[PDB]
């Protein structure tokens with residue numbers, strides 16, 4: 550029938566991480582494509598989670614998610630209303646605010662949270678899904694300028710990742726980017742004051 554044939558939307562799945570625990574940032578893959586698709590459909594992820602910044606995927610998109618204040622945060626435009634796969638099955642969001650482009654799930658067991666930044670620094674560092682660390686000069690509360698011209702493609706897929714201060718605290722999570730003739734010029738982020746329940 551029509552209703553028998555209705556497909557169920559799958560879960561966000563953790564497929565990797567951006568390791569920030571030593572003197573060198575680097576990306577790690579923890580699931581390949583077939584395992585991602587299977588875990589999206591079941592909602593059951595028995596991998597052990599580590600760290601603060603996760604690489605996440607749906608059936609159709611990949612982006613980042615960052616734990617702050619005991620919640621794994623990402624962008625609504627990547628995750629929508631989806632559950633996240635976990636060792637106990639799919640986990641429903643505990644925070645959803647489309648108006649901030651923001652969602653959150655309770656942080657996975659075994660993860661760690663970044664500390665909110667209280668520095669008021671304007672020297673920021675954007676962490677990409679390739680573990681590039683991009684200097685950004687803060688312009689107000691939710692925005693920053695890129696110091697050096699990079700093609701916008703270098704930033705695609707990095708929404709949900711952190712902006713860090715010089716001390717490595719979280720200033721916000723990356724939401725959107727502004728470019729001119731293909732060159733990324735500025736970034737827009739969800740400030741950390743909002744990354745709390």
Ligand SMILES: COc1ccc2nc(C)c(O[C@@H]3C[C@H]4C(=O)N[C@]5(C(=O)NS(=O)(=O)C6(C)CC6)C[C@H]5/C=C\CCCCC[C@H](NC(=O)O[C@@H]5CCC[C@H]5F)C(=O)N4C3)nc2c1
Nearest residue numbers: 610611612626627647650704705706707708724725726737
């Ligand atoms: C559906 O419900 C909602 C609700 C709220 C909501 N809110 C916003 C802001 C929103 O924006 C969408 C998504 C976001 C995006 O692509 N995000 C990044 C990413 O990487 N995503 S991603 O991981 O590839 C992806 C797609 C998840 C997998 C970080 C960029 C990287 C590259 C940019 C590429 C070209 C696009 C340039 C856009 N620029 C822009 O909007 O600039 C704004 C307007 C001017 C000022 C500034 F704030 C931009 O960045 N966009 C446009 N969608 C929604 C949708």
Ligand SMILES: [Zn+2]
Nearest residue numbers: 666668714718
């Ligand atoms: Zn700080």
